Amino acid sequence: PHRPILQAGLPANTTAVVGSDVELLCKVYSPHIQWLKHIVINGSSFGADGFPYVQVLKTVEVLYLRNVSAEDAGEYTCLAGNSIGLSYQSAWLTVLPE
Template sequence: NPLLFYKITDVSVCFEFLDIIGIMRNQAGRYECKASNDVATPDFKYVNVVVNYPPTIQKIQSSETPVGRVGMLQCDANAVPKPEFEWFKDDKRMTNTQSINIQMLGTTTILVFSNVSEEDYGNYTCVASNRLGIQYASVFLFRPGTGRDINSSPCVSQSLWLLVVCITLLFFNC
């Protein structure tokens, strides 16, 4: 670590620098600098190190909601600086209306449908961005019983059963 000395009248001042090359997110936090010699009591100074990084979407939550009920789509993202969020359906940017409310809670955004209609069903895109980058995630609002589970993955129980039956038939017919 480089030391810089400055002569001011008869007093020497020393500056110590800590270079963290290739700093990672988990290295952010409070650091302590301690100066000591054999003459005076040690002096402590603290510095808060902030590591900036682009958004990473951590969690999305789709919704299986009947017509006429309240539906919610959720998107959580980590980023420094804090991410800004936008919601899209197809190429249309979503805004607050009488039936749709976009809520921001720190690093989470929730798209709330106060009264789900047939036109509301579909694929929505959550966009998290800051000055360092952008990330997208698809979230679904779907009708109950349309073949999707709560995590937006297709229900495969019937498909797997049919696949097992077909493979069994092929195996025994050969």
């Protein structure tokens, strides 16, 4: 009768170089999972009314990221939810050129 319970540590803030691959982790203890990215539009991740630009990416839970680019970095979030509610932990990805 609760919101889903997630492993506290993950996802962890990851730093990667461009052209390399990235793996983000999520661990559910229990309940569907979908990852999200926070979209930055004109230097603002928030819209007109004050809602965030957030996009669903997929549906231990790993997310494969191959050949990361500059637009691939930002905030990633793991959404777990059930009949009662939701729980989410966010991490930030960093892309570095060569």
